[PDB]
Design a protein around this ligand. Structure first.
Ligand SMILES: *[C@@H]1O[C@H](CO)[C@@H](O)[C@H](O)[C@H]1NC(C)=O
Ligand SMILES: *[C@@H]1O[C@H](CO)[C@@H](O)[C@H](O)[C@H]1NC(C)=O
Ligand SMILES: *[C@@H]1O[C@H](CO)[C@@H](O)[C@H](O)[C@H]1NC(C)=O
Ligand SMILES: *[C@@H]1O[C@H](CO)[C@@H](O)[C@H](O)[C@H]1NC(C)=O
Ligand SMILES: [Zn+2]
Lengths: 596, 190
């Protein structure tokens, strides 16, 4: 009769019909990833295209049910998902031109090589090579060569291609009732139709800047301390009032500062915690690692793994003649099928990432009862944050004592506490200015407020003001340095890394109160706590059926992202850092340059 | 008096779909239910309505039926007196004054193939103990359509994709339903 009854019928056939195809397509991908043959890839190609051709045909007749005559909110969410025109709005020739442009960027980035001077025969690549230098070299004139050459041969050839990438993808957003491409990516945080929970697309910019204004006092103190320790390594290359050259941060792009731990350890005579030796002495294997991590989730009230998880998953390198891809991943094949692919080793690094992957699986079980189109996290930054907080708890010394890996005769002193936090700070805090600046540069380029003749000029002006990193060699308008990163060249959004960091410390703080934890936030463990698990399970079982604003309120009791819990985690490090820079300068001056 | 045919219908080679269930008839025989009690752990569901589950062997009925089909593990709770679901609306219905027993068990290694179907849409709920075996397209705004896959026209039969790798809730189950009649009549099964 009405238009809602005929819309629910379309959402009743699709759910049962799409699930069948999604299982077969995901079954062919598993076989190739565990058995690499030229015949197994044929099954993936044959099965995958069937699913791809299924969606466009089904979405074609989903546009004939208008959205202005439906009052039931759970139906509008599903209909809006299937009403997305996508890249199908562009013409026949414009779509092809965009498609070949993207494939070119993936090809050039993966096969890029640099040939060293005086040896024109043997050349060096990135995945091995250039990396090794940017992780294990202390020579000033050798790191500079690798930094500049890669951006001179790979980056320069991406300059003309990236210009067309903006203009061909801005018009796609304009036809889709968005004023630019940047607003497309900001639509993942949009909530409409619920009173008291609305979140406009333009409010993401205001909130990100508001939270970042409270991070600078912590960032400057860590920035000044790193600069002082780096003057010892390189005698006459760093100024005490200036910035840090871009080729001395422990990696190629400055994204993470983890490789600087050797030169910036506060107390070098005290070693870190490593339980690899204790595991091999007790004959731990791959099966034991995944058996112990399952017990962690049972204690907090969450369910345990299915029978098919053990019979079907892959937890050890096949060896012999069978080949496979060794990237750790979590699979949701459909129809209640969950597996894990991992080339496990008996180490501490592999013990922690087992909890990270198994945390993903628990999320997938929670919303398996939801409709098919509403089976995901609240937004792009929710799935990763859930897994991260599980690895934080397992890495605590108190947890390791319980599972018998660390002896009860292990005393924790304040010296080792600072060492642990600085290692964490060089990875979490150090990447926040980098993520905020790059996304801001991409956002303002799409709006068009940065002219094509000032792309590089404003790139390094924001670097010196927000990140405080100066270039070693002047870069003119023919360079495309931001395109040298994997995410930028391969069309991936970057703002999910900023929100994931903030979400993961709001979740941790809320869960530690439910467990009645007293003391610094970095020692809190959520094991054997049913209240923490019950609070977390309410968010997990919602899925995409509810606004992320309300889902966040179910755990932390707030409707907006906050940065205060992040500073609480790193508060002890803040006090120690101030006492180090009393006889030193905090901040940087933009007028300095190593080339003048 | 001869022995009941319960072991010839409780163990066959092929079972039908829910939309087409069989009604093998049991009459003029003596029956022994201890065979279904020795293999009690093989049944994932043993529910009896009207009569007690234990101490039912010494009963006398005026007529006993038997219906058997294959349904997924997520639709097993729908076979009961009083429910809406999807099976209780269009595939198999039980009267509210039903008396009998319901049995089900897992057959993941036998019925794990394509070929089992069930009804999805129809015009109105069916009556108790009704059999529908039509294959005509369905519409949400009129009578009969002549083009499945076309706007407001839908095919009413969905396949039970059966794979041994799937979860427990999506794995095949075989259901046998026994109905007992206890009115004033000559005794047939005792
Ligand atoms: C892997 O693929 C090869 C293809 O020649 C096949 O012979 C082999 O049986 C496969 N391995 C497994 C475990 O199925
Ligand atoms: C949306 O429809 C479902 C159908 O089961 C119903 O349960 C739910 O209450 C409806 N929500 C609204 C907005 O009323
Ligand atoms: C989960 O643990 C409970 C208690 O040990 C057990 O009864 C149940 O069978 C387990 N489920 C699985 C399949 O791990
Ligand atoms: C076949 O099944 C019937 C009941 O389902 C059982 O009594 C009989 O013993 C089974 N056959 C065998 C060989 O076990
Ligand atoms: Zn992950």
């Amino acid at each position: 009769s009405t238009i809602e009854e005929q819309a629910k019928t379309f959402l009743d056939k699709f759910n049962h019909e799409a699930e069948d195809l999604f299982y077969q397509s995901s079954l062919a991908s598993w076989n190739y990833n565990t058995n690499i043959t030229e015949e197994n890839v044929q099954n993936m190609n044959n099965a995958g295209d069937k699913w791809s051709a299924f969606l466009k045909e089904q979405s074609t007749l989903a546009q004939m049910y208008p959205l202005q005559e439906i009052q039931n909110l759970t139906v509008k969410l599903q209909l809006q998902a299937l009403q997305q025109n996508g890249s199908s709005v562009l013409s026949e020739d414009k779509s092809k031109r965009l498609n070949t442009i993207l494939n070119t960027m993936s090809t050039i980035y993966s096969t890029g090589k640099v040939c060293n001077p005086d040896n024109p025969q043997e050349c060096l690549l990135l995945e091995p090579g250039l990396n090794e230098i940017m992780a294990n070299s202390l020579d000033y004139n050798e790191r500079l060569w690798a930094w500049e050459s890669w951006r001179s041969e790979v980056g320069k050839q991406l300059r003309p291609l990236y210009e067309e990438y903006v203009v061909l993808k801005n018009e796609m957003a304009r036809a889709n009732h968005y004023e630019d491409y940047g607003d497309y990516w900001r639509g993942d945080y949009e909530v409409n139709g619920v009173d008291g929970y609305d979140y406009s697309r333009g409010q993401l910019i205001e909130d990100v800047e508001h939270t970042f204004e409270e991070i600078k006092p912590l960032y400057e103190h860590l920035h000044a301390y790193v600069r002082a320790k780096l003057m010892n390594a390189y005698p006459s290359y760093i100024s005490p009032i200036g910035c840090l050259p871009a080729h001395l941060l422990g990696d190629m792009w400055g994204r993470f500062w983890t490789n600087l731990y050797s030169l910036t350890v506060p107390f070098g005579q005290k070693p870190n915690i490593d339980v690899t030796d204790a595991m091999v002495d007790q004959a731990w294997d791959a099966q034991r690692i995944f058996k112990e991590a399952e017990k962690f989730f049972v204690s907090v009230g969450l369910p345990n793994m299915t029978q098919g998880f053990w019979e079907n998953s892959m937890l050890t390198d096949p060896g012999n003649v069978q080949k496979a891809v060794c990237h750790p991943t979590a699979w949701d094949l459909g129809k209640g099928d969950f597996r894990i692919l991992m080339c496990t080793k008996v180490t501490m690094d592999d013990f922690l990432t087992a909890h990270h992957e198994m945390g993903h699986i628990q999320y997938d079980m929670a919303y398996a009862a939801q409709p098919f189109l509403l089976r995901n996290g609240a937004n792009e930054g929710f799935h990763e944050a859930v897994g991260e907080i599980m690895s934080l708890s397992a890495a605590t010394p108190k947890h390791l004592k319980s599972i018998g890996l660390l002896s009860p005769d292990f005393q924790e002193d304040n010296e080792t506490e600072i060492n642990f936090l600085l290692k964490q700070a060089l990875t979490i805090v150090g990447t926040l200015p980098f993520t905020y600046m790059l996304e801001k540069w991409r956002w303002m380029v799409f709006k068009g407020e940065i002219p094509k003749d000032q792309w590089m000029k404003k790139w390094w002006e924001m670097k010196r003001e927000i990140v405080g990193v100066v270039e070693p060699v002047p870069h003119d308008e023919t360079y495309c340095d931001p395109a040298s990163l994997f995410h930028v060249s391969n069309d991936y959004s970057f703002i999910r890394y900023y929100t994931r960091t903030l979400y993961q410390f709001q979740f941790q703080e809320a869960l530690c109160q439910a467990a009645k934890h007293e003391g610094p936030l970095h020692k809190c463990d959520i094991s054997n706590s049913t209240e923490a698990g019950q609070k977390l399970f309410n968010m997990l079982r919602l899925g995409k059926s509810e606004p992320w604003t309300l889902a966040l309120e179910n755990v932390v009791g707030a409707k907006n992202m906050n940065v205060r819990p992040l500073l609480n985690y790193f508060e002890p490090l803040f006090t120690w850092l101030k006492d180090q820079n009393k006889n030193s300068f905090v901040g940087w001056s933009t007028d300095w340059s190593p080339y003048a | 008096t001869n022995i009941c045919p319960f072991d010839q219908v409780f163990n066959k080679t092929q079972f039908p779909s829910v939309y087409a269930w069989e009604r093998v008839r049991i009459s003029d025989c003596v029956s022994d239910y201890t065979v279904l009690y020795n293999s009690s752990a093989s049944f994932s569901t043993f529910k009896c309505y009207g009569v007690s589950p234990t101490k039912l062997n010494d009963l006398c009925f005026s007529g006993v039926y038997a219906d058997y089909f294959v349904v997924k593990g997520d639709h097993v709770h729908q076979i009961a007196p009083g429910q809406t679901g999807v099976i209780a609306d269009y595939n198999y219905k039980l009267p509210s004054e039903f008396v009998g027993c319901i049995l089900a068990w897992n057959t993941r290694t036998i019925d794990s193939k394509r070929g089992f179907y069930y009804r999805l849409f129809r015009h109105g709920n069916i009556r108790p103990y009704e059999r529908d075996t039509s294959n005509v397209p369905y519409n949400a705004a009129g009578g009969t359509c002549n083009q499945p896959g076309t706007h407001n026209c839908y095919e009413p039969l969905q396949d039970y994709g059966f794979t041994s790798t799937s979860g427990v809730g999506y794995q095949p189950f075989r259901v046998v339903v026994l109905s007992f009649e206890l009115l004033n009549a000559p005794a047939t099964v005792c």
